[PDB]
Amino acid sequence: SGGYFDAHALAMDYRSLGFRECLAEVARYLSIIEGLDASDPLRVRLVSHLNNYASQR
Amino acid sequence: SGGYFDAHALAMDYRSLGFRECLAEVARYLSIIEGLDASDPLRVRLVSHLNNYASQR
């Protein structure tokens, strides 16, 4: 408030970004390395689990 | 360092922490939900890939 900015709260926002960086790598890895397409059961279950985990937090 | 709060350093730590939280959830999810033990090929490759990706950063 006022002339003060909560840079600590801003720092905490990096947690969700780091979490999603890993989520993105999970999707890329499964797709490109493991060769699991967009309809693969495991790929969809795992990535959606991570999405829901992040949203809950 | 110095007499001030370094929000930059804290942000970097939250970023690295968030990435590892996703990695932790991936390992836990595979074990508990998917039922893949610690020596399962897929789980081993994915968890090891992410762990290496993290350290690489």
How far A56 CA sits from the closest chain B CA (Å)? 13
* B8 to chain A: closest CA residue: A11
* Long-range contacts of B48-53, Cβ-Cβ distance < 8 Å, separation of 24 or more: B49/A25, B49/A29, B49/A33, B50/A22, B50/A25, B50/A26, B50/A29, B50/B22, B50/B23, B50/B26, B51/B23, B53/A22, B53/A25
Question: Which candidate from B5, B19, B29 shows the least CB-CB separation from A22?
Answer: B19
Ordered domains of chain B (ranges, CATH) = 5-57 (6.10.250.980)
Experimental technique used to determine this entry: X-ray
